[PDB]
Nucleic acid binder design. Structure first.
Ligand code: ZN
Ligand code: ZN
Ligand code: ZN
Ligand code: ZN
Lengths: 63, 1482
RNA sequence: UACCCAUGUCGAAGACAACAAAG
RNA sequence: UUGAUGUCACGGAACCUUUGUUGUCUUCGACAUGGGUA
């Protein structure tokens, strides 16, 4: 469940710490890879809990 | 002394050129330099600038001449004239200086030793060699030695690869520049011959010059004697100024599709109603007008110029959207010439990518003049591959070294083919291709690409020459040419999808014996008949046919013919063609082109890639060296099966079907979700025929396992399990029969209890004849929606899952209206007929799918699949917390207001104030009176009861003007007072100065005038302020005279053009001379009554009290302006509209005057007028539980979410954390294909009509019935305010009744009066009750409870019914579903009958409903009550209330009185969420 | 600064969301 | 714009893998406007 992984590292991510950001980027890239190569992990039809906070953290990561 | 002979080389083919290399790179070690020593060379005028020109060295020509001389001497026993020639010398001691060494054998004729290293006399071959500069070859250059910008100005670079014979895949490649002979045919040079050279050497040189047929990679004869950028920028600017960037990639491709013809611009689609408001071509000048003047340009009149213009425009828009040895062969040499044609029997693909064009992923090779090219390299490679197939031995040679001596290489060393081009220059077609994720069933990430395809029917000239010592062609060559003459010439790439199959036709051949002196001399004289004139002369003497191979080996591919027969519509999507087509639809089916002569004929077809993918999916579920990898190929090995395009036997005309998505809350059309499609019509009565063929390798066809695999897959395809094409969920692409011919029956061999009745319902609804019930009610959902993390995958038939079919019958219990919306004038007023497909009455599978989905989403508490989550609601206020203000970070507060008469005749203010003072930008100076004093002369017989002395002054027209002193002489004021009974009777004579004690009262009178009225000069301040004019906007317009407009005296004036010239004509209340009103007439708009004569004036500006405006207030203001400027009910005349609507105010600006309500710090609501609208703080999707909103939905929060565009995790912000609801797991969502398909419902028997038809002879057409107005559902009624107490009540269901009878009589279902025809109401063809339709629902991978609950949602219970079609609020469209067949799939061959196991499924479904909702299944009972069909002799009265009671003859309360009575906002949700709750008792 | 309402007209949605080439 | 007694480059298929597809009832009732009197 890559999406649960992304959720965990998002809730534990602090943007000051470079290691946490690198791990979050690794999780995001792993999910991207699962989407690219058709697999069972593409059957993950869920989203993210706490949409405002998750959106804020993702936007900060992209900034 | 020496003689110079001038030499000219004429090229008959595109020749090859190298790239310029640094002067240090010109060495033996450079691999690229030595690889290109047999090509033309590029000369740079200056080292660092690419400007230069081509040339051919004299060394290359000398080497070719030496080789030709060796051949000629071998054919003549080494005797040129009388003299004989030694074998020559080819041994140098210091090899290192030589750039290249001879890796080929030297032809031997005579055995004596070479000429002495220092001899007085040398043989002619040595003089030609240069042993005795006796002969100097110069360089060959273009005539006049022109210059070009670079090598790309004369040619293009192409990739030439080397493939593996076994795998069929390339493993390396190289590049070279190819220069066309049409543009650069001739090169010129000179040969300098010394006088001492023998005449025999001269004759040998001339013979070698005439015998040299190839140079630089081509056949040669040697003789010796800005609008597009401007248009793109304009279109882009129009796109950005109108905020329509998303369409760029749709506009890039569609305009590219215009490269075929300039006439296509005039045939661009228009909007519905036929006007120029297309959502693409009229975005602007419009883009259509940009492309229409571009087609009238003299420059772009030519087809080529238009094509280049369109290609450049498309590329620009796409880019914006993105942003030694001595061996004797003997004297026997023969040359066989074979001439004919290669005709494309399938579309072909010779891959060649241009790096200056990035719009297309895969591109075909063309000539500079846009003709199709059959390259020599591809023909040679295919010949080599076929020779290797004949010999069954791969050639394990490596580049470099001595020549390979296998039979394939020996035959290939004598082979010459000629490069060919076509006479057909039309643009290639573009095909879309995708890849499907097996698990979800939708496309994979990034799997969407384009491919350029060359049309079929193109004829290529073909010429082959074989030179060899044999009597004629080799046996292998004869066999290969026989294969090519039978259509087994697979010459191009993309062979697995049926590309590049050619047939050789009109083949003629002739063998010339070059060992004969006379024939050899004739061959030399005519230059071997290589040029066009010599080629024609040779063709006149060519023998027809081809030699027959002595040892013939069978071809490796066999053709299997496919016949598909489909009883359903079919579409293969082509969105781009739909954008340039006059039909104006969202999608059209795939169409390909066939080249007939130089013209292109369009034919409808089924793409080969789609069939290949469907078949591959079929084989992969009833089961790298896997069977799939050995049958269908992989990224490592080429496939053994080649699918072709399937074309329809009889040409079908496309038909247009309209679809709309229904909101689950309002029961009406969802926003922006109305669409159409153009499939190919198919039906059980007249099916679609698809004829085609594929090719299978024989070795696969003789293998048992592969044939068994294909047979099981094709058996499942024949059994309807795998639909063809798109949109199978709505009944498209059902394969009724598939048949395979030509396989020797090796694959074709494998292809080979009543239903329990419905339970009677326990639902009880008691109907009383006195009451009147509402047409619809809401089912309040349960608080819990079960979701699952992982839905089932489409990758295999899972164990314990039921896959099969349900045959069902639908019965009409009330009249049904399913309209055919292609024609709006079947019987302006719109008329529609019943939906038909080829004169057969049908119901589309989308209608039934939506109807059954609405009930399945309710039986299993699920998400509201269709919901306009982003809708913001507004409410009209009624006639205290709205304070004046002026804008702008903050709005200031004004202390007080006053009415300034503007449209009356008492003042002349319109003259005395400038435009800016009227607009409100500049402060004004006006006197304000707050209270007006009114006096009674006598004590009443009034809290103030002021008593004071009054002195009369004058009396006229009844009124008395006098001055009054009161407050013990403190306050003196003048006024006019009308004669009052019991008070003015005291004073009857005019003494002009009489004293009288009087009582003065004070009345509120808030008025402001620029100049003090001359009647009353006392009691006025001089406060500044701002004048807010909205305009005369309180207007009560109507088409019939009321009371005020009827009481007008005189002619009604016309409505003036200016809104400043309005002046009050009449008074509503004439006794008191108040309520001023302006009355006017204008044509069909009829009567306008303006009851507003005072504007507003805000004074006592308090700057300190300024309040912040958050973005919420601004977006609410924007919504208010949008609903103001997009009002269908707006007054026809703009002079009676407010400034925010008259001048189309799109945003608030600094200095605007408003009424606002605020908290301690921020503003909460802003309105432009006194009585206005109020917008909701939340979007409607926030008025329901998050478990009820769609699983995959919209952004209802306060975030742009466009910042995370171009990032994938954005999809995770629109999906539910817990997964998919039961309805989304069955019917599917955008990211997940559903497990159910609903087919079209055909009518079993003859139709029964509601209204008898006009023609008694035609029982297949029915009479028309006219319906009352169908108007939008209003969420404002269900949700009557912004309070959190108001929620979305639930799913809306319409009740069953018989109100359709009154409409059939022609009467309004509420008033009982006649339905008069209007431009907005509709006329429909309807069927009556008792009609039976039969349809079919296919399911795969269903759990037991899903089948049980789907069966329940279909059949429900006896006493329950479904609602389908239009006018459901008027009683039409009650239907019932009874399941007749459930067939289940156990094996690919065995299908069991499942009518027996229906009970258990149902029970298990209910068992699931118990663990989900434990003893709280109350929404089921409400749904049952709403689905309740009224019993016989029990006829409820169900209708909508009118606007007012005065409009309803029956005396039932209207909407206004109901709003404050039975349907007050407090109990409205409980009365509307309770099924069968009345609103009138009668 | 307190009350009071008054008038009866009118169509809407017309495609949206995703994939835009990877190996 | 070459050197020369030694060029099989017509010595080399831009080839191989990928479903324009997934999701959607041609549906439907109370709304619109801003003031007026004291
Ligand atoms: Zn010699
Ligand atoms: Zn070989
Ligand atoms: Zn495999
Ligand atoms: Zn859902």
């Amino acid at each position: 469940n890559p999406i649960r992984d992304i959720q965990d590292r998002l809730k534990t991510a602090k943007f000051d710490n470079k290691d946490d950001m690198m791990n979050l980027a690794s999780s995001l890239y792993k999910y991207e890879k699962q989407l690219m190569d058709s697999s069972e992990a593409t059957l993950c039809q869920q989203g993210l809990s706490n949409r405002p906070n998750s959106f804020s953290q993702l936007s900060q990561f992209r900034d | 002394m020496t003689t110079t002979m001038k030499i000219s080389i004429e090229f008959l083919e595109p020749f090859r050129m190298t790239k310029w290399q640094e002067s240090t790179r010109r060495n033996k070690n450079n691999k690229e330099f030595v690889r290109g020593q047999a090509f033309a060379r590029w000369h740079r005028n200056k080292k660092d600038n690419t400007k230069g020109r081509p040339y051919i060295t004299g060394t290359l020509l000398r080497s070719a001449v030496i080789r030709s001389a060796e051949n000629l001497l071998t054919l003549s026993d080494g005797k040129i004239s009388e003299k004989t020639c030694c074998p020559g010398k080819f041994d140098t001691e210091d090899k290192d200086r030589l750039l290249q060494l001879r890796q080929r054998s030297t032809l031997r004729w005579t055995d004596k030793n070479p000429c002495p290293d220092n001899a007085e006399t040398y043989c002619p071959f040595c003089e030609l060699l240069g042993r005795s500069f006796r002969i100097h070859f110069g360089n060959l250059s273009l005539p006049g030695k022109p210059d070009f910008d670079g090598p790309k100005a004369i040619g293009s670079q192409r990739v030439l690869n080397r493939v593996d014979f076994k795998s069929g895949k390339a493993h390396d490649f190289f590049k070279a520049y190819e220069v066309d002979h049409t543009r650069f045919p001739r090169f010129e040079g000179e040969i300098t011959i010394d006088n001492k050279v023998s005449a025999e050497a001269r004759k040998l040189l001339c013979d070698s010059l005439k015998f040299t047929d190839r140079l630089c990679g081509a056949l040669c004869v040697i003789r010796f004697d800005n609008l597009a950028e401007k248009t793109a920028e304009q279109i882009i600017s129009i796109l950005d100024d109108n905020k329509k960037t998303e369409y760029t990639r749709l506009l890039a491709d569609a305009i590219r599709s215009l490269r075929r013809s300039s006439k296509l611009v005039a045939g661009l689609p228009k909007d519905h109603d036929g006007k120029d408001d297309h959502y693409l071509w009229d975005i602007g000048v419009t883009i259509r007008q940009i492309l229409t003047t571009s087609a009238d340009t003299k420059e772009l009149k030519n087809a080529g110029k238009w094509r280049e213009f369109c290609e450049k425009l498309g590329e620009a828009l796409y880019l914006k959207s993105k942003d030694s040895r001595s061996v004797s062969i003997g004297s026997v040499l023969k040359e066989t010439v074979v001439c004919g044609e290669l005709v494309a029997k399938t579309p072909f693909f010779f891959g060649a990518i241009d790096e200056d064009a990035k719009q297309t992923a895969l591109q075909v090779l063309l000539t500079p003049d846009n003709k199709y090219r059959l390259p020599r390299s591809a023909v040679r490679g295919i010949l080599r591959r076929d020779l290797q197939t004949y010999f069954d031995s791969p050639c394990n040679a490596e580049l470099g070294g001595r020549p390979c001596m296998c039979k394939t290489c020996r035959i290939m060393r004598g082979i010459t083919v000629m490069d060919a081009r076509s006479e057909y220059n039309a643009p290639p077609e573009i095909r879309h291709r995708t890849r499907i994720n097996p698990f979800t069933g939708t496309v994979a990430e990034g799997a969407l690409f384009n491919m350029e395809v060359a049309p079929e029917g193109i004829v290529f000239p073909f010429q082959l020459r074989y030179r060899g010592s044999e009597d004629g062609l080799p046996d292998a060559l004869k066999t290969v040419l026989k294969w090519w003459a039978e259509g087994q010439a697979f010459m191009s790439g993309a062979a697995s999808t049926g590309k590049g199959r050619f047939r050789m036709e009109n083949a003629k051949y002739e063998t010339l014996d070059l060992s004969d002196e006379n024939q050899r001399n004739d061959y030399l004289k005519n230059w071997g008949w290589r040029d066009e004139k010599g080629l024609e002369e040779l063709k006149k003497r060519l023998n027809s046919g081809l030699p027959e191979p002595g040892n013939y080996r069978d071809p490796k591919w066999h053709e299997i013919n496919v016949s598909i027969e489909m009883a359903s519509p079919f579409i293969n999507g082509d969105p781009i063609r739909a954008a340039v087509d006059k039909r104006g639809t969202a999608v059209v089916t795939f169409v390909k082109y066939k080249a007939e002569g130089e013209e292109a004929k369009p034919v409808c077809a089924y793409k080969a890639e789609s069939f290949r993918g469907v078949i591959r999916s079929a084989v992969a579920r009833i089961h790298c060296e896997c069977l799939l990898c050995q049958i269908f190929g992989s990224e490592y090995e080429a496939g053994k099966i080649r699918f072709e395009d399937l074309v329809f036997e009889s040409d079908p005309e496309p038909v247009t079907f309209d679809h709309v998505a229904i909101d689950r809350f309002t029961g009406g059309a969802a926003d922006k979700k109305k669409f159409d499609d153009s499939p190919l019509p198919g039906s059980p009565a007249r099916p679609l025929m698809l004829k085609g063929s594929f090719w299978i390798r024989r070795d696969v066809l003789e293998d048992e396992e592969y044939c068994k695999a294909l047979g099981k897959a094709l058996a499942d395809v024949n059994n309807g399990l795998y639909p063809l094409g798109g949109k199978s969920a709505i009944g498209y692409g059902q394969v009724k029969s598939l048949g395979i011919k030509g396989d020797d029956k090796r694959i074709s061999r494998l292809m080979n209890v009543a239903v329990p009745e419905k339970p009677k319902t326990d639902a009880e609804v008691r109907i009383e004849a006195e009451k009147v019930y509402y047409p619809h009610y809401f089912v309040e959902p349960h608080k819990k929606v079960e979701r699952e993390e992982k839905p089932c995958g489409h990758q295999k038939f899972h164990e314990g899952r039921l896959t099969g079919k349900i045959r069902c019958k639908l019965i009409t219990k009330t009249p049904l209206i399913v309209p055919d919306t292609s024609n709006d004038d079947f019987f302006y007023h719109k008329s529609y007929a019943f939906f038909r497909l080829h004169k057969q009455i049908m119901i589309p599978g989308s209608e039934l799918r939506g109807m059954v989905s609405s009930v399945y989403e309710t039986v299993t508490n699920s998400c509201f699949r269709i919901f306009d989550e982003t809708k913001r609601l507004s409410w009209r206020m009624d006639a205290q917390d709205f304070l004046p203000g002026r804008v702008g970070k903050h709005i200031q507060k004004f202390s007080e207001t006053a009415r300034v008469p503007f449209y009356d005749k008492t003042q002349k203010h319109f003259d005395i104030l400038d435009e800016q003072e009227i607009a409100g930008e500049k402060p004004v100076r006006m006197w304000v009176k707050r209270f007006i004093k009114r006096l009674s002369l006598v004590d009443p017989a009034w809290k103030r009861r002021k008593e004071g002395i009054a002195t009369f002054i004058e009396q006229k027209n009844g009124s008395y003007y006098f001055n009054v002193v009161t407050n013990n002489g403190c306050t003196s004021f003048h006024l006019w007072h009308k004669p009052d009974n019991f008070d003015q009777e005291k004073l009857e004579g005019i003494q002009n100065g009489e004293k009288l004690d009087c009582w003065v009262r004070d009345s509120r009178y808030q008025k402001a005038f620029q100049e003090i009225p001359e009647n009353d000069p006392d009691g006025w301040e001089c406060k500044e302020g701002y004048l807010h004019v909205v305009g005369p906007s309180k207007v009560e317009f109507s088409d019939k005279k009321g009371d005020v407009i009827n009481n007008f005296q005189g002619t009604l004036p016309s409505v003036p053009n200016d809104w400043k010239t309005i002046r009050t004509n009449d008074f509503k209340n004439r006794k008191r001379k108040n309520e001023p009103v302006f009355c006017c007439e204008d044509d069909k708009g009829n009567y306008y009554t303006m009851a507003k004569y005072c504007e507003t004036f805000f004074f006592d500006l308090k700057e300190n009290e300024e309040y912040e405006i958050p973005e919420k207030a601004r977006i609410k203001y924007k919504e208010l302006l949008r609903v103001y400027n997009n009002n269908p009910q707006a007054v026809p005349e703009s002079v009676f509209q407010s400034r925010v609507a008259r001048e189309n105010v799109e945003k608030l600006k600094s200095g605007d005057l408003v009424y606002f309500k605020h908290n301690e710090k921020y503003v909460e609501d802003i309105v432009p007028v006194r009585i206005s609208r109020t917008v909701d703080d939340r979007m409607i999707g926030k008025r329901m539980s998050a478990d009820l909103r769609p699983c995959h939905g919209d952004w209802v929060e306060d975030g742009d979410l466009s910042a995370l565009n171009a990032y994938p995790e954005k999809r995770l912000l629109l999906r539910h954390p817990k997964g998919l609801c039961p309805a989304c797991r069955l019917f599917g969502t955008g990211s997940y294909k559903g497990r159910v398909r609903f087919g079209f419902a055909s009518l079993e028997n003859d139709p029964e009509w509601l209204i008898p038809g006009k023609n008694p002879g035609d029982p297949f057409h029915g009479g028309p019935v006219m319906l009352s107005l169908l108007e939008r559902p209003r969420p404002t009624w269900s949700i009557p305010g912004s309070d959190n107490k108001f929620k979305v009540p639930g799913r809306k269901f319409y009740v069953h009744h018989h109100a359709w009878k009154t409409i059939k009589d022609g009467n309004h279902p509420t008033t009982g009066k006649a339905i008069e025809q209007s431009p907005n109401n509709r006329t429909v063809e309807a069927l009556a009750g008792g009609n039976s339709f039969s349809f079919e629902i296919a399911f795969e991978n269903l759990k037991e409870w899903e089948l049980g609950l789907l069966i329940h949602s279909l059949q429900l219970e006896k006493g329950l019914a479904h609602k389908l079609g239009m006018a459901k609020s008027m009683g039409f469209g009650s239907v019932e579903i009874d399941v007749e067949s459930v067939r289940l799939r156990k094996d690919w061959k065995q299908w069991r009958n499942g009518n027996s196991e229906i009970p258990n499924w149902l029970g298990k479904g209910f068992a699931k409903l118990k663990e989900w909702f434990r003893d709280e299944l109350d929404f089921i009972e409400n749904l049952k009550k709403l689905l309740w069909f009224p019993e016989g002799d029990q006829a409820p009265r169900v209708c909508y209330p009118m606007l007012r009671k005065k409009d309803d003859p029956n005396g039932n309360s209207g909407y206004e009185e109901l709003k404050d009575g039975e349907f007050k906002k407090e109990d409205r949700q409980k009365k509307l969420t309770t099924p069968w709750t009345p609103w009138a008792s009668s």
